[PDB]
């Protein structure tokens, strides 16, 4: 004997934007390529790297990429591009 | 939807170059801006155009 | 709340953060510092964390109005063939003694 059901009311969700880490350490990158995609500055910009309107990190010059910690209790993070020894 | 948009127009060449947004209900004063007008090739005072 | 000098230190921290964040080039900064007695200046070069040249009212001068600290440091910088700097108001305001110093520096070939 079937009965009455319904009113789930909770069947919605949004598309998952692929924020994360697009470039790990030791990678060759050319200016314009984006290192880190995030929402809010979970990773601060170091030297020779830029911060877009969407808070997308992107390099300003060609070289290796380095991550590094800082902050009150070693919790904050900078990502920076180190030049070649040219 | 709500038709909150509006168009800006030059007062020398009378083109409708720009488009912007404006809430008529709160500020009814017609916009008086001065942006770069391509045809005039300088900065020209723009007024709202219906 | 502060001691009339802690605010100056905080302001200088603000401004040095600004230059260290905005200076794409390696232009040597020109940090002027203001004391109630007199004034002194050093040329700090970043990306190296050293001082290239410095000057002060302690070059046998009295209290300050004595813009010679502009000309002498300009001489040192032009000898080091830099002659293009970003100015820094320390924690003070660009006015009075600081303005006179900056004009003296600019008039003798500095690029700012």
């Amino acid at each position: 004997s079937k009965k009455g059901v319904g009113s789930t009311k909770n069947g919605r969700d949004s598309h998952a934007k692929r924020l994360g880490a697009k470039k790990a350490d030791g990678q060759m990158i050319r200016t314009g390529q984006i290192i880190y995609r995030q929402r809010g500055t979970r990773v601060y910009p170091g030297v020779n790297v830029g911060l877009g309107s969407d808070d997308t990190l992107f390099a300003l010059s060609d070289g290796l990429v380095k991550y590094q910690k800082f902050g009150p209790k070693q919790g904050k993070t900078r990502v920076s591009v180190v030049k070649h020894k040219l | 939807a709500v038709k909150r948009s509006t168009r800006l127009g030059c007062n020398d060449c009378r083109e409708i170059n720009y488009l912007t947004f404006k809430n008529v209900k709160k500020n009814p004063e017609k916009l008086a801006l001065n942006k770069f007008c391509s045809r005039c090739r300088k900065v020209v005072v723009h007024k709202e155009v219906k | 709340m502060k001691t009339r000098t802690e605010q100056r230190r905080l302001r200088h921290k603000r401004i040095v953060k600004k230059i260290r964040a905005t200076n794409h080039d390696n232009r040597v900064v020109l940090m002027v510092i203001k004391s109630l007695n007199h004034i002194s200046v050093q040329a700090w070069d970043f990306s190296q964390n050293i001082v290239l040249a410095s000057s002060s009212s302690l070059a046998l001068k009295l209290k300050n109005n004595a813009k010679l600290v502009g000309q002498d440091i300009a001489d040192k910088l032009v000898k080091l063939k830099l002659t293009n700097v970003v100015f820094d108001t320390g924690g003070s305001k660009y006015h009075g003694r600081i303005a006179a110093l900056a004009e003296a520096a600019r008039e003798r070939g500095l690029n700012f």
Binding site: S1, K2, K3, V5, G6, S7, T8, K9, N10 | - | -
Partner: protein, 136 residues
């Protein structure tokens, strides 16, 4: 009946109970406690039954301490219904018990009285209990 007064969410997920007794591992207040030897979900009704049993067989001489508490809720789809179409309503609270947690403990009364009271209480709980004395 032990029960949280109010909560944030009404339909939480089930909480596993197969571990080695994170927290509540050792006796802390009395000289004799009850320790489980097989983790299982024990609801508030069994808790109240054990509590009233210990209270009735204790007397006006000592104290009894309860350690666990039914924080987690639990759902039960009503009778005679196909599955799907949402999640069932909450019916009964339940205290998660991992194997090796002191949960009941009494004091200030003869030793054989702790033994008999804890054995009386242990037969109401599904878990296989075990008597434990407080360390020195």
């Amino acid at each position: 009946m032990l029960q949280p007064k109010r909560t944030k969410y009404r339909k939480p997920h089930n909480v596993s109970y197969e571990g080695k007794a994170k927290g509540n591992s050792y006796v802390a207040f009395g000289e004799y406690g009850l320790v489980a030897t097989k983790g299982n979900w024990i609801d508030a009704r069994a808790i109240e039954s054990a509590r009233i049993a210990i209270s009735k067989c204790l007397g006006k001489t000592g104290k009894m301490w309860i350690r666990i508490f039914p924080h987690m809720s639990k759902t039960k789809k009503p009778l005679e219904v196909r599955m799907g179409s949402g999640k069932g309503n909450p019916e009964f609270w339940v205290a998660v018990v991992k194997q090796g947690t002191v949960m009941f403990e009494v004091a200030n009364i003869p030793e054989s009285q702790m033994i008999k009271a804890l054995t009386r209480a242990g037969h109401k709980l599904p878990v296989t209990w075990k008597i434990l004395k407080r360390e020195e």
